[PDB]
Design a protein around this ligand. Structure first.
Ligand SMILES: N[C@H](CCC(=O)N[C@@H](CS)C(=O)NCC(=O)O)C(=O)O
Ligand SMILES: N[C@H](CCC(=O)N[C@@H](CS)C(=O)NCC(=O)O)C(=O)O
Lengths: 208, 210
């Protein structure tokens, strides 16, 4: 019973939509334009003044990672046990930390900052290659042997980064292979090929 | 040896909430402290997954990332809500807290003097959500989410205590948050913890700004 309220961009909803799609879930998308948002109705009713907003039946949630964690929890995408559950979170927050750095670049200081960001990037991605190398030679998922919600969010982050700086995964053979393995998952592959994903901008200021 | 170990700088910083949680739950833990000089040397930083502290050890489980540690303790100590729905709201609260913590960190570390006024003027609007949450949960009389304490109470409690030092009386505009802070502060083990030398004699931040 799902509904996504967001702007006409991929942004902080790309990973959760990836997840819904791969898990064969159905959801309603509700779009929010510039004048709708600016008016100030919807914003005044949002817990933190912001989007996405997510409905799951009688349940309203804000916060992209809360949404992720909720879906991981209820669809069984949160590790096999608490140890795994913790590694999942650790992966997600690293993903979130770098996503926070990406957004800063893109929205605040794209122009001058991009040169130094792409320089810092391999060191920012290494931790994830390391994680995979220690989890069955990288042949499965980021954590344990089943997909988790940190996989979708990590996958999103990897794709938007190959756009920012193509070839950035070249030096990382487990990440490269991981990205191709999950991309080829049938429902994910189709969603990533769909107009609904392809014809949406990554970001709001039209900088990718 | 205690099963827990906290490897961090000699600061409250990102470990206050988890230390309060451990203290309030009556768990023992070991503090390994890292000095700037040990860090500058550079050897432990290269062992650190994301190259950062805090690092945490439950047995041979090495965790990084402070909210991950909190969620991990939230899961293993029963501080994550009663059902799947409460866990989601605990998460939405904690994510809310993490968002304001990040603005605060950017204030204190990369802009204190120019930013502080706008920051302290934007504050009431940042705190209101948390007052709203309380208002809608048994009229603000228990915890942030449901009727048992959760890990987000501890992170929210810490974030509130630090803003009260940054901008005293900011909770004056917020009667449930205030009652909230006083009510949680006075929990017996937490009370003793917040009055003890291991809490009191550490600075909130690394740069002595607060
Ligand atoms: N904590 C973030 C909040 C998302 C956020 O940064 N919201 C932005 C768009 S991605 C927004 O609604 N900006 C419009 C506004 O602040 O009025 C999350 O993970 O969900
Ligand atoms: N993502 C943060 C990581 C903690 C962090 O930002 N650590 C800082 C100090 S609080 C640090 O280790 N500084 C050393 C460095 O960046 O190299 C978390 O929530 O745990």
């Amino acid at each position: 019973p799902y509904t996504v309220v967001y702007f006409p961009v991929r942004g902080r909803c790309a990973a959760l939509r990836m997840l819904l799609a791969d898990q064969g879930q159905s959801w309603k998308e509700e779009v929010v334009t510039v004048e709708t948002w600016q008016e100030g109705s919807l914003k005044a009713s949002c817990l933190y003044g912001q989007l996405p907003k997510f409905q799951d039946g009688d349940l309203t949630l804000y916060q992209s990672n809360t949404i992720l964690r909720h879906l991981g929890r209820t669809l069984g995408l949160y590790g096999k046990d608490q140890q795994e559950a913790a590694l999942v979170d650790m992966v997600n927050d690293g993903v979130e930390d770098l996503r926070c750095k990406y957004i800063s670049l893109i929205y605040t200081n794209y122009e001058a900052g991009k040169d130094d960001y792409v320089k810092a990037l391999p060191g920012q991605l290494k931790p994830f290659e390391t994680l995979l190398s220690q989890n069955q030679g990288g042949k499965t998922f980021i954590v344990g042997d089943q997909i988790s919600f940190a996989d979708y969010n990590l996958l999103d982050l990897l794709l938007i980064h190959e756009v920012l700086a193509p070839g950035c995964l070249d030096a990382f053979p487990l990440l490269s292979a991981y990205v191709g393995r999950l991309s080829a998952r049938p429902k994910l592959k189709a969603f990533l090929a769909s107009p609904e994903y392809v014809n949406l901008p990554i970001n709001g200021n039209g900088k990718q």
